Amino acid sequence: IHQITPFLHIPDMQEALTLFCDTLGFELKYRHSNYAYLELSGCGLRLLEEPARVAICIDVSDIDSLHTKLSPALENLPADQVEPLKNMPYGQREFQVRMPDGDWLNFTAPLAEGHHHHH
Amino acid sequence: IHQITPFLHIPDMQEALTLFCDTLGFELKYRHSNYAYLELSGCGLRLLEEPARVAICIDVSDIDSLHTKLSPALENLPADQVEPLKNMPYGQREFQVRMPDGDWLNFTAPLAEGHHH
């Protein structure tokens, strides 16, 4: 378990970057399409431009061992409040759980051997 | 800058603790009234029961030096989108900034020297 990042959904990426980067000092680390990943002294923050959604993303190593550890408990959640492990197009393996406020939580790890790794 | 914690506002504390602690593995570290602070492998997550607000809390040390460094840029933000440094009755010194999604962000730190911790 590396870090817990809020995943914000904002209307204008440039305005968001103006606040978080230029005003608050966040460093823009990675960007693809309408997605952005920032860090303030190492702590991550995810942004998605949007002119239920994922509000939290938990970065981890070996998401399979974590998923197995949590499996028995995840089996007790309403079927529509949990998603199975899935290799995503953007280079991350992840699974989802719905939170009490209605938004979703993501567990995510970069793909290991045998896959294209995005920088 | 120690961590960036999401600050969730949930319908029922017990139901939320069951999910995060019992199902996902988080540890409850402090609770008071409708507020709770948990950690997963040392990573923070804050909760508030509510049967626009702060959705992000950034835990820091020496928040006074940080405020000074951000001050010039904070001065260019709409007046109603920024709050000055202020000591809170709940043991933290914080300042706030409104985010592009309408919710707020907190920079917070426990009172330094001279205070009961």
Domain holding B78: CATH number? 3.10.180.10
User: Which helix (H) or strand (E) segment is A68 a member of?
Assistant: helix A63-74
Residue A38 one-letter amino acid: L
Q: Position B69: which residue type?
A: K
| Torsional class of B90: left (φ above 0), alpha (ψ -120 to 50), beta (otherwise) | alpha
Domain region containing A42? 1-119
A116 close to B26: Cβ distance less than 8 angstroms: no
Task: Using the Cα atoms of residue A18, residue A20, residue A25 and residue A26 in order, give the sign of their dihedral.
Answer: negative
A74: enclosing H helix or E strand: helix A63-74
Chain position carrying tokens 């509510």: B50
Q: Pick from B78, B89, B87, B76: which is nearest to B109 by CA?
A: B87
Helix, coil or strand: residue A112? coil
Give the C-alpha separation, B47 to B8, whole Å: 5
3-state secondary structure of A64: helix
Rounded distance, CA B34 to CA B50, Å?
Answer: 8
Structural Rg of chain B based on CA atoms = 15
A43–B99: do the CB atoms touch at under 8 Å?
no
Identify whether the C-beta of residue B107 lies closer than 8 Å to the C-beta of residue A17.
Answer: no
What total of structural domains would you count in chain A? Answer: 1
What whole-number distance in Å separates Cα of residue A52 and Cα of residue A100?
11
Nearest to residue A95, comparing CAs of A87, A104, A84, A105?
A84
Q: Which of A53, A87, A85, A59 is nearest to A71 (CA)?
A: A85
A82 DSSP 8-state letter? B
CA distance linking residue B50 with residue B93, whole number of Å: 23
Helices (H), B47-93: 63-74
User: Which of the residues B1, B2, B4, B96 would you substitute to probe the A interface, choosing the one with the greatest number of A C-beta atoms within 10 Å?
Assistant: B4
Contact B4 A40 (CB under 8 A): yes
Q: Please name the amino acid found at residue B36.
A: A
> Using the beta-carbon criterion (under 8 Å), do A6 and B6 form an inter-chain contact?
yes
